[PDB]
Amino acid sequence: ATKAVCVLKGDGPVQGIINFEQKESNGPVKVWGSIKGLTEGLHGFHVHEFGDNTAGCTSAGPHFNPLSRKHGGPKDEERHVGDLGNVTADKDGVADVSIEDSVISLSGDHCITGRTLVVHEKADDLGKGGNEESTKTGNAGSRLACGVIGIAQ
Amino acid sequence: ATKAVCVLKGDGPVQGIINFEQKESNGPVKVWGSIKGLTEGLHGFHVHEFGDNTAGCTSAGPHFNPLSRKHGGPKDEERHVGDLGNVTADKDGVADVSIEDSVISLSGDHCITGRTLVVHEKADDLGKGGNEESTKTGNAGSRLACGVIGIAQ
Ligand SMILES: CC(C)NC[C@H](O)c1ccc(O)c(O)c1
Ligand SMILES: CC(C)NC[C@H](O)c1ccc(O)c(O)c1
Ligand SMILES: CC(C)NC[C@H](O)c1ccc(O)c(O)c1
Ligand SMILES: CC(C)NC[C@H](O)c1ccc(O)c(O)c1
Ligand SMILES: CC(C)NC[C@H](O)c1ccc(O)c(O)c1
Ligand SMILES: [Cu+2]
Ligand SMILES: [Cu+2]
Ligand SMILES: [Zn+2]
Ligand SMILES: [Zn+2]
């Protein structure tokens, strides 16, 4: 299998760890881990284009969108490659992450390694919020924590 | 051109920003930036195999060595792909980094993106130190700061 990993950190209480595994070349990718320090509710969860955190999470740019599509949710045909939806935190501030996605990859054209995974302030409206920004970012707000996705053993 | 970047941080005071640019496909790579919080002198500077910083810089594994060679310096034929030698800190505690390297790449099998850049405790002896460990790590000691190398705009 191919494996990757991301340490999420930022300028506040939000921290996390997210693991990735892809059993077959170009096959589905399992994404799992835990994020703590979150306000209760939904937090947008995306791979952004660049693995640049020079000035913090802002430096990562827009969602990873190699195919020039509008923002959506992971189950949509019309989505960014980086659109992984939301993670959901309880009152404990913890979101347990367990996702399988067939659009991201750990090899090829849609490869997410070397790019930034970001957990956002607010909910991602999955492109259904009614303004143009919904179709770009899902109105998920600021970047609470992030890290560069790296190759794992 | 193709560009990459790495933010260095650790348990202590060492912090850095390192930029990479590769003008031509498969061409040499320019590596430049600054690292502060260092003791004066030489500090080993390497790309390590894994972009895994789960438990800190130790998680990054050994020097990146896709071609199964021994450790050396950046101007040696016999070196690991990750062997970028030493950076040098002055009495300001800052290393002003400006390297060109013909072995690392930002694509292909020598791609360092998604892997970890590490700055070490002590000098790298470039494989000339006279023990077995010289030929593996250059005796450069602990990992002061590191980051996962990401794709840049
Ligand atoms: C190592 C275990 C905890 N990971 C889950 C498993 O490797 C996996 C599950 C679903 C997938 O789509 C996958 O590529 C890989
Ligand atoms: C502002 C632009 C993107 N137009 C909004 C679009 O006509 C629209 C209307 C109703 C909806 O429910 C919606 O998600 C999107
Ligand atoms: C902005 C400056 C630092 N760019 C350096 C230049 O793009 C460059 C110099 C030497 C090289 O080998 C290279 O790939 C690229
Ligand atoms: C990607 C942007 C935000 N960073 C540019 C980088 O900080 C930089 C550009 C030109 C330089 O000469 C330099 O030392 C450093
Ligand atoms: C800031 C402390 C560590 N003093 C550094 C000193 O003023 C200094 C400045 C510039 C240098 O190049 C240097 O070697 C030493
Ligand atoms: Cu995002
Ligand atoms: Cu090293
Ligand atoms: Zn998106
Ligand atoms: Zn080495």
Active-site residue identified among B43, B79, B115, B143: B143
Specified resolution (Å) = 1.5
Helix (H, G, I), strand (E, B) or coil at A12: coil
Q: Tokens for B54?
A: 């789960």
Task: Classify the phi-psi angles of B29: left when phi > 0, otherwise alpha if psi is within -120 to 50, otherwise beta.
Answer: beta
The technique by which this structure was obtained is: X-ray
Instruction: Give the domains, in start order, of chain B with CATH numbers.
Output: 1-153 (2.60.40.200)
Two tokens, residue A48 = 């952004």
With CB atoms and an 8 Å threshold, state whether B152 touches A116: no
Q: What's at B52, amino acid-wise?
A: D
Q: Which two tokens stand for residue A101?
A: 């996605």
Put simply, whether B148 touches A (Cβ < 8 Å) is yes
By the 8 A CB rule, do B82 and B133 touch? no
Burial A85-112 (b: 16+ CB within 10 A, else e): bbbbbeeeebbebebebebbbbeeebbb
Phi-psi region of B145 (alpha: psi -120 to 50; beta: other; left: phi over 0): beta
Answer yes or no: B48 catalytic.
Answer: yes
Give CA separation, B41 vs A135, A144, B79, B90, in Å.
51, 37, 22, 7
Burial class (CB in 10 A: 0-12, 13-18, 19+), A29: buried
B46 assigned binding-site residue: yes
- What residue ranges in B9-152 does DSSP mark as E strands? 15-22, 29-36, 41-48, 83-89, 95-101, 116-120, 143-148, 150-152
Nearest-CA residue for atom 15 of ligand 2: A130
Q: How far is CA B105 from CA A149, B25, B114, in A?
A: 18, 9, 12
Contacts for B81 with CB less than 8 Å, ≥ 6 apart: B47, B64, B65, B66, B67, B103, B104, B110, B112
A86, two tokens = 């939301």
Q: Which of residues 38-57 of A touch B (CB under 8 A)?
A: 49-54
Distance in angstroms (rounded) separating the CA atoms of residues B32 and B53 = 22
